[PDB]
Amino acid sequence: ATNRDQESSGFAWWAGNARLINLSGKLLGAHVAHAGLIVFWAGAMTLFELAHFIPEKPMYEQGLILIPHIATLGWGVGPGGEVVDTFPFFVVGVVHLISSAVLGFGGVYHAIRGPETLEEYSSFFGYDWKDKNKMTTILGFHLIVLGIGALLLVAKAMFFGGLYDTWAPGGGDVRVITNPTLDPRVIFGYLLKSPFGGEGWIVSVNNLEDVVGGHIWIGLICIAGGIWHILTTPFGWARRAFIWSGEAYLSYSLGALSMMGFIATCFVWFNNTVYPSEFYGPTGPEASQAQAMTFLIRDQKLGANVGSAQGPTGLGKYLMRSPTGEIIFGGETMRFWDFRGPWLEPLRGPNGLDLNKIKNDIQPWQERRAAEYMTHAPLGSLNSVGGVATEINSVNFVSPRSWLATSHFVLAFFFLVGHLWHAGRARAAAAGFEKGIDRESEPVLSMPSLD
Amino acid sequence: ANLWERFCNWVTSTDNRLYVGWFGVIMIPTLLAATICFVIAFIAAPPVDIDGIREPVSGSLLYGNNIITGAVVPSSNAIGLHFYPIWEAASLDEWLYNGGPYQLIIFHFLLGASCYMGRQWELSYRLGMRPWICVAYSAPLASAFAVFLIYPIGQGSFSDGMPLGISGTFNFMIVFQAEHNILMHPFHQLGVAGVFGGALFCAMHGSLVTSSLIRETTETESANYGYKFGQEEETYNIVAAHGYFGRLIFQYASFNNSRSLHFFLAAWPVVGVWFAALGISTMAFNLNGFNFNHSVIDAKGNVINTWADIINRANLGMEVMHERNAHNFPLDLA
């Protein structure tokens, strides 16, 4: 039993997996088996969701997070996001589960049966963490694989039915993307937008053309870079900048994943283009705005002049100005005037909300959507009691947006912590003092006194 | 050596009275800026329209506050999450009315403190220490992020960030309880276990080590003189302390391993406070405390109150009274 107790391995049982750092075969086992766990959860969770799925209820009334992901891709839904055929959901689930059986098989094989190290076995599949060439080669492989994935999204969008477009003229509908945005000015323009209000960095992407074109770009960049890293080895400055070890690489990827988790959190919380509100429920901003809209409609029906109604503070009760002048909804939702959504934009003019359009052009579907979104705001309790914290039990609701946002903030945070842990440890071990201070060579004792 | 080399050498020098370092290169100016702006604002800033309804709140000493009531007031709800630097205002007077000082201070501070954490890693590295003190510090830092950045993001406005002031902090807590029932949230509860427990174990540890100090002094002098800085001998009898505590509870409830013990002393409050931070950070996205309002019902269907329902009444008081002129529509949706 190579390296499988504390005395031999140096690592206690609770740091057990650290025993796999230079056992590439068994480590391959751990990784493929884990991938099997992930694919498993995808499949199983999907079949579960589907079994609990009532097609005429909104998805977000039913605790669904995966079926909304499948629907956003165009599968299973028609105009307005109505579920028109559940079979693609079924397919996605089944296939993921079946594939998880395979991955599990390979994982268990490499983990407890196959070669414990892969270097004697194959010079292709074996690796030394310190071997910068091989590392960048594997990195390259996987870059190409990712670029391929992004290109798969592109292909689904352009050649295999398209994607669900909440912004589609005449209403939300699945649409084929024929003219993806290829201009680098737009694509990377996103990357240079401020993350602050009314800007929102890449989270602000608000049309499918930009999404698809961005994924084209990302596919080419990834394949190109992957080839690049297969063909090259790290330069001098790179060599002198980094710690080159398994734990170091782990730390880097942990930092990257943290970053991505935070980004995903903001995406699912603010964006309603790649997270259509038809499937995921309204965003927070969206629902607050929707309340404003709702009571403007009610009161205007009663004969109120909503453009001239002065609220108690002196600000308009229904309508006011943004700090730069645009006409926006009043009350607290003044904070949310950056919100944009298909049900509200018909009332927007060049100077913001348009009073004439508000007086004359509000359609019943808009009233409906506003009431729906107002009454499904992403507020609810841990035991899934829908509404404000003082609401009585009756409605079983917590928005998918809350679930996704919170889960991924927690995961991103703990992954930042993980990056600090393994980065600091990587440095300490590479420099050779991760196990403590050498009593006979205590560095501070050879330093001059501070005072 | 060239100039840049010399410079790097001084920056990363282990001989500086206060360690600078590359994290320190960002830390020192941002913290100085946050500090200076904070002191000046706390003393002399005019009232701030926190809730964006032309209802300015006075935070500074010169404008009618004392230490307890005073605050640097959060930026205007009209601003929301917009970036509001000085050069975005038409004038300093505008900037002050709309609560610019707040954004300047919390951004510079969050950057600075992040770099403080980094700097802790860095000096540990320069001195040949193990690296994880900075990880212990990540817990209070994460909390700071939670109340100054994350919760505002989730709610769509820095006007809902915690105020830089004592009473304002209390305002934040009470409103938070009203809108999230934070007390009924298991992560806040884990945070309370974190700090109650941290206090408990602090006292416990202090008292046990103090109890087993080896006699090195006379009765007419401080026992502390019995320890000299840098001495190689441990200054207390850990077997005596363990005999004591082990008999206080039972043997195997007690630590005989100092490393293990101290690890515990680090891990418990750090983890607890991590969950407190995550509690604020997830209640930022309105996933709230347990709601057992009207959970117990009799045979006819009469509601039977529990203590949870009394909590709910209190929360209602807070809810209906807070920001009394800011709501026009019946649901407080952020």
Binding site: - | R17, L18, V39, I43, L61, N66, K228, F229, Q231
Partner: peptide, 30 residues
């Protein structure tokens, strides 16, 4: 006078920071 008092106490505290750090009694090993 209140404001003066508050700022004065604070200022004293900062001064005290300065002395406690740069004019501390230096730790010495035996």
């Amino acid at each position: 006078m209140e404001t003066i008092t508050y700022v004065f106490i604070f200022a004293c505290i900062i001064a005290l920071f300065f002395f406690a750090i740069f004019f501390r009694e230096p730790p010495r090993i035996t």
